[PDB]
Design a binder for these strands. Structure first.
Length: 110
RNA sequence: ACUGAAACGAUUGUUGUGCCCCUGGCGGUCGCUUUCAAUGCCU
């Protein structure tokens, strides 16, 4: 499989966005009691139940972009530190810190 | 530069501590192992 798909991707990262999108379609299944909260309650919104022309509204749980992207993002940074591509030590030449001035400008996460 | 670029309401926490299905209660009451029988027949 991966040997055939190597044609689709860019050969190096472009300056301008070119309009090649690889989309991952997933079902995230709860396995033990997640708590997607802000403001002290589980985040919810009213939605229509389904696309087939319903009158019927339905309160569904919302997992915000932050609540899923950051757990993916940070699990990449700890892998890069374990491979020794980036460092946690302030005296290293390949330091990367998640939010402040000390963010790298080179590493895969950035 | 989409009023733009990146953006975890988070960290920690035992529904806990004590508690006797407990107390009282007769398997009880009535009941004939009974009824009939030649140690017998001869010397």
């Amino acid at each position: 499989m991966l040997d055939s798909l190597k044609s689709q991707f860019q050969p190096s990262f472009p300056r301008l966005a070119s309009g090649h999108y690889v989309h991952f379609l997933m079902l995230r299944h709860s396995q033990s009691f997640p708590v997607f909260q802000t403001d002290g309650v589980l985040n919810t919104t009213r939605t229509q139940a389904g696309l087939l022309e319903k009158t019927d509204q339905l309160s569904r749980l919302v997992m915000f972009k932050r609540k899923q992207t950051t757990p993916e993002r940070l699990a990449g940074r700890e892998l890069l530190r374990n491979l020794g591509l980036t460092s946690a030590d302030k005296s290293a030449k390949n330091l990367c810190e998640y939010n402040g001035e000390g963010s790298c400008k080179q590493c895969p996460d950035c």
